[PDB]
Nucleic acid binder design. Structure first.
Lengths: 81, 252, 224, 215
RNA sequence: AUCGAGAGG
DNA sequence: GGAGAAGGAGCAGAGC
DNA sequence: GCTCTGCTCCTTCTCCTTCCTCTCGAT
């Protein structure tokens, strides 16, 4: 369902790690960067900037024990940590 | 001990006598069969049992007390007469009872019968106490007790540390607080109280092992372990007869 | 053997610990739902002490001089004097704190007050005392109503589970019982007004800080 | 023990009390003073003038409380009886069974004096839908649910069970299990498929509820 | 390529 | 080394 | 009353394993 999502609104350290990894990979594959490259050449550092600015174009499918799932977007998730 | 007797070592002694298992053998010196012995029920055989007075004094046993137990186990099949507690030799004399012949005669009975009596006696007369319970150590232990002021004050109480486990009988002993009794056996505490008690005890013992060397592991980790071992309503070991005997993926 | 036996035990996104089969091991991971790495040993002040000492440290009575707050503690401390409406809130607070003693005495029968709980509140308070330059010679702008309700609001906003079903809501109430006992015992009216003489700004900051850290202590899903 | 050695009688008395507590916990209308019967009163009411606990007189009928009924609509009447004969033979087991059949009791408890033969044991589950539970007087001397290691067990209704499984997206097989032979399960008289809510005190949180299903 | 032996951590 | 699994054996009851 | 039909109550048997790393020296 769209609403009634029972999982946390915060981004977990595992979600953050994979988001940065997969985005950094795309960057290293010469994908378009959605933030200004302020002297940044390191895919990971670049990805972290996008994370801070919530520019990372991804959605986390959180699978629940019974096979069902809740889709949360990067923008929705609270990148605290 | 029952709260009210927490500071009563005499009650502790009474309980120790009630629990500390005593087999006749343990308080005897020697046994002889004879064909200046002290009063159907009469044979020419004189089973002479010499008791250890010092041991009986230690165990608070009287010959009358022992005799009543003997009569209970042999009923009227064995004729028994006891010497006095003030006698130097605490002699118990037994004769074979047999209305089938001894009714009007002193016929010699089979020695094998006496041998059976000897073993049936010496090795099985449970004079007193709970089966399988051996040593019973009486000692004071300290414990904080919320005083009348509301503040915890450390108090001392007598606790009986026994050697062996038999909850099925110990729990019913008068003068004992059945809710505080604790063992080391997971299987027995489980079978007696239930899987939740077993699991709880399981944790406590795991804790004791780790804590025994001064180290510390977070409750959360130990709790997880014992919870897993008790999800099936029993005690699942970490062996191939525990873990491997599951419904989990074959490749695992 | 231990690693193999527990190889597949994981915290799922429902905050429940399960194995490969999906069998529930713990409905709430660790019986609290929090990561051991974020746990610190703290003192549950209300467990110990005499009942009289407790009363002296936690009972506030604006109707009797025996426990009426010293006016100078507050900018309006002379106005709260005789204020029955605030006394009602104070009675609510104290009553709960009395209940807390009953409860914790049942939970920890050995009287031990030092236990591993998430969020070192004591240290948080010290940060406020220093950060806002808490001048302990000046009357504060705290309101008894604001303190009582402020703490209660914090408790409501702690969260761990986020379902709506009474089953989950009940579990939520139980999951944070000790932490809430800690909050209530640590942030009582006298504790806040006499021991930790914070300003409204500092006090509010403490509450919001506790919330943030508490949420950070909750175990993440996917944790092995 | 001897009639003189009333200890035997007091053990019986204890068992009697624990049965009253059990029946009460099962949801039947047992009062507190009914449970709290003094030994000398037990003797006055049940023990023969010659110091002989009239075990037959210790039998009684229990009736589910209004609250128990509202939660468990199908909860019927309970007959409790203690065996007068040391060793339970089918001749007495059948007698007990017949009583239930004639009185149409939903369930009945039969307490062993000393032991029971297989000839009787096989009969105990021969009259569906009625259920006969059995206990040994020795086992009943102490009520194990008061032990420090035993937490409060709550037998859930079928509605509570259904909601539980739905809420956590669980299948019955994914709940923690308890064997029907488990002392406590026996105390509660759990039937296969029933779920018990267990409330424990903890060190990481004030208390923690856990669910366990009867196998 | 197996197989044993000697060690190191 | 200490399980567990398979097998022979020795008695309470029970039907003719 | 006496063998009979079951047991359940025992004794008497088969099975398994830190990590990791180096070298030589045989077949």
């Amino acid at each position: 369902p769209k609403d009634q999502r029972a999982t946390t609104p915060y981004m977990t350290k595992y979600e953050r790690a994979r988001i940065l990894g997969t985005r950094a990979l795309q960057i290293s594959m010469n994908a378009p960067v959605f933030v200004d490259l302020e002297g940044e050449t390191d895919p990971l550092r670049i990805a972290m900037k996008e994370l801070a600015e919530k520019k990372i174009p991804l959605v986390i499918r959180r699978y629940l024990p019974d096979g069902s799932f809740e889709d949360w977007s990067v923008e929705e998730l609270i990148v605290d940590l | 001990l029952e709260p009210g007797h927490a500071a009563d070592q005499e009650q502790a002694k009474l309980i120790r006598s009630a629990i500390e298992h005593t087999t006749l053998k343990s308080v005897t010196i020697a046994s002889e069969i004879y064909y200046p012995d002290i009063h159907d029920q009469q044979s020419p055989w004189l089973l002479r049992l010499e008791l250890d007075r010092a041991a009986m004094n230690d165990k608070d046993l009287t010959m009358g007390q022992v005799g009543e137990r003997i009569k209970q186990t042999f009923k009227n099949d064995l004729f028994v007469i006891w010497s006095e507690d003030n006698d130097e030799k605490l002699i118990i004399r037994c004769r074979v009872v047999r209305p089938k012949s001894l009714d009007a005669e002193t016929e010699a009975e089979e020695d094998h019968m006496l041998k059976k009596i000897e073993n049936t006696m010496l090795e099985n007369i449970t004079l007193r106490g709970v089966e399988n319970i051996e040593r019973v150590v009486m000692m004071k232990y300290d414990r904080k007790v919320p005083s009348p002021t509301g503040e915890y004050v450390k108090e001392p109480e007598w606790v009986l540390e026994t050697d062996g486990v038999n909850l099925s009988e110990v729990m019913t002993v008068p003068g004992i607080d059945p809710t505080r009794i604790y063992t080391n056996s997971f299987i027995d505490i489980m079978e007696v109280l239930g899987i939740e008690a077993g699991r709880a005890a399981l944790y406590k013992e795991v804790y004791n092992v780790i804590a025994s060397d001064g180290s510390y592991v977070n409750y959360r980790h130990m709790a997880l372990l014992v919870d897993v071992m008790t999800t099936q309503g029993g005690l699942t070991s970490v062996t191939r007869h525990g873990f491997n005997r599951s419904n989990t993926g074959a490749l695992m | 053997r231990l690693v193999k036996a527990l190889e597949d035990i994981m915290v799922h996104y429902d905050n429940t610990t399960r194995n490969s089969l999906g069998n529930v091991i713990q409905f709430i991971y660790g019986e609290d739902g929090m990561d051991a790495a974020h746990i610190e040993k703290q003192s549950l002040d209300t467990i110990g002490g005499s009942d009289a000492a407790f009363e002296k440290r936690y009972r506030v009575d604006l109707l009797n001089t025996d426990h009426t707050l010293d006016p100078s503690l507050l900018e309006s401390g002379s106005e709260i004097l005789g204020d029955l409406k605030l006394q009602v809130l104070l009675d609510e607070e104290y009553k709960q704190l009395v209940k807390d003693r009953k409860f914790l005495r049942e939970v920890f029968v050995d009287g031990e007050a030092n236990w591993p709980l998430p969020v070192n509140i004591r240290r948080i308070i010290q940060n406020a005392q220093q950060t806002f330059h808490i001048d302990h010679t000046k009357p504060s702008d705290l309101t008894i109503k604001d303190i009582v309700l402020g703490v209660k609001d914090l408790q409501e906003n702690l969260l761990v589970l986020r379902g709506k079903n009474e089953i989950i809501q009940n579990a939520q109430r139980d999951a944070v019982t000790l932490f809430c006992c800690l909050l209530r015992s640590r942030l009582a009216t006298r504790r806040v007004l006499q021991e930790y003489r914070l300003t409204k700004q500092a006090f509010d900051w403490v509450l919001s800080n506790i919330e943030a850290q508490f949420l950070r202590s909750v175990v993440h899903p996917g944790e092995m | 023990m001897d009639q003189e050695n009333e200890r035997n009688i007091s053990r019986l008395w204890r068992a009697f009390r624990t049965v009253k507590e059990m029946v009460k916990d099962r949801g039947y209308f047992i009062t507190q003073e009914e449970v709290e019967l003094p030994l000398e009163d037990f003797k006055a009411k049940y023990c023969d003038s010659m110091g002989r606990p009239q075990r037959k007189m210790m039998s009684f009928q229990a009736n589910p409380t209004e609250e128990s009924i509202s939660k468990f609509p199908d909860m019927g009447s309970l007959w409790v009886e203690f065996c007068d004969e040391p060793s339970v033979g089918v001749k007495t087991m059948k007698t007990f069974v017949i009583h239930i059949q004639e009185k149409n009791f939903q369930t009945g408890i039969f307490v062993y004096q000393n032991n029971i033969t297989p000839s009787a044991m096989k009969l105990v589950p021969s009259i569906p839908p009625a259920t006969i539970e059995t206990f040994n007087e020795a086992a009943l001397v102490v009520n194990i649910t008061h032990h420090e290691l035993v937490p409060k067990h709550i037998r859930l209704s079928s509605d509570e069970k259904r909601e539980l499984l739905k809420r956590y997206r669980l299948k019955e097989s994914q709940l923690p299990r308890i064997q029907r032979a488990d002392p406590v399960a026996l105390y509660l008289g759990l039937k296969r498929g029933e779920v018990v809510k267990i409330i424990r005190k903890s060190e990481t949180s004030g208390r923690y509820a856990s669910y366990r299903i009867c196998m």
